[PDB]
Amino acid sequence: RFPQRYVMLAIVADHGMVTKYSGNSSAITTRVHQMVSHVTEMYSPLNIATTLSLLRIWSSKDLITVQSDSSVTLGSFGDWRKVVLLSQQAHDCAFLNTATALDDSTIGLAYSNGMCDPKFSVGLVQDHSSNVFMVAVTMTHELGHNLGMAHDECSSCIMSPAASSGPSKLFSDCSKDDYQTFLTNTNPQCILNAP
Ligand SMILES: [Zn+2]
Ligand SMILES: [Zn+2]
Ligand SMILES: [Zn+2]
Ligand SMILES: [Zn+2]
């Protein structure tokens, strides 16, 4: 249905994550890999090949102030991504994986249509469950917003506004249409490039 596309993803695990998993960077790495495998599987149907270009773990201190308000944190993260992370290695989008509970009890945030933008191609995902698939669905959902998708307002589809108890790995037809609109009206250049 869609032309070949690629999302060269960067993930940053904050200091809260290191604390949560008892300083075990190896365990965090294994966790993110599984998360990405799930994300990758969920994007295949849209002909988007997702890969983890890099993983950063803030084992010393956070490089930005990570706070309970997702909006402020996402903005600081986007500034850091544009001014620092992009200088280290090319990538299409970066997501901050945080252990910190958000102040409005949400579990993620992203910039709509931000894919490829130096500053706005970022997302925020709270490590809200021991079930990695569940957290991967949230990351997939936020990448969805980055890719121009709006909420399904299908209750079990990825872009559902609320996190189902039994989430599926499918994008709604509305979600696919939003993605189509995105490719047509935006058509960001970075995701055309294979790793
Ligand atoms: Zn520490
Ligand atoms: Zn707030
Ligand atoms: Zn959403
Ligand atoms: Zn090449």
Side-chain angles (χ1 to χ4, degrees):
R1 189 184 184 305
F2 311 86
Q4 182 66 62
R5 285 299 184 288
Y6 309 83
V7 173
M8 304 159 255
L9 185 72
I11 290 181
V12 173
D14 73 353
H15 184 266
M17 286 293 290
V18 181
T19 297
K20 181 173 176 183
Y21 292 98
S22 308
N24 196 329
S25 294
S26 304
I28 290 180
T29 299
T30 291
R31 190 182 178 78
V32 172
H33 284 180
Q34 172 185 171
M35 198 178 300
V36 172
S37 287
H38 284 309
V39 173
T40 295
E41 177 185 355
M42 286 181 264
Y43 270 101
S44 293
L46 303 187
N47 231 319
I48 295 174
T50 60
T51 54
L52 181 64
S53 298
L54 65 95
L55 168 62
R56 291 282 182 275
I57 298 174
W58 288 341
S59 70
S60 188
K61 298 184 181 184
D62 288 321
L63 300 189
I64 63 171
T65 296
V66 182
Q67 47 196 298
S68 63
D69 184 69
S70 56
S71 194
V72 171
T73 299
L74 217 220
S76 300
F77 186 61
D79 290 342
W80 183 78
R81 190 238 171 190
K82 171 180 178 174
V83 304
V84 181
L85 193 60
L86 265 172
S87 302
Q88 306 173 343
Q89 184 183 325
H91 61 283
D92 307 329
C93 183
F95 273 32
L96 175 60
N97 196 17
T98 184
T100 303
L102 304 182
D103 74 1
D104 58 353
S105 288
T106 50
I107 54 181
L109 191 72
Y111 291 115
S112 292
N113 299 133
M115 183 59 69
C116 297
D117 186 277
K119 188 278 176 54
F120 297 116
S121 195
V122 293
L124 179 306
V125 182
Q126 201 258 316
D127 191 46
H128 66 89
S129 174
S130 58
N131 183 323
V132 180
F133 171 66
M134 285 186 71
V135 181
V137 165
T138 298
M139 181 169 280
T140 297
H141 177 108
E142 303 303 339
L143 277 166
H145 284 303
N146 284 150
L147 293 166
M149 299 174 193
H151 287 164
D152 287 322
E153 305 178 302
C154 177
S155 48
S156 63
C157 292
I158 297 173
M159 297 312 292
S160 181
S164 171
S165 288
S168 73
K169 304 178 189 172
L170 307 176
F171 276 110
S172 70
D173 292 291
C174 298
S175 290
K176 296 183 180 182
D177 295 312
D178 295 341
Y179 178 46
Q180 181 55 65
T181 303
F182 182 68
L183 290 178
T184 296
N185 289 188
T186 299
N187 184 53
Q189 156 79 200
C190 89
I191 57 171
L192 286 173
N193 307 308

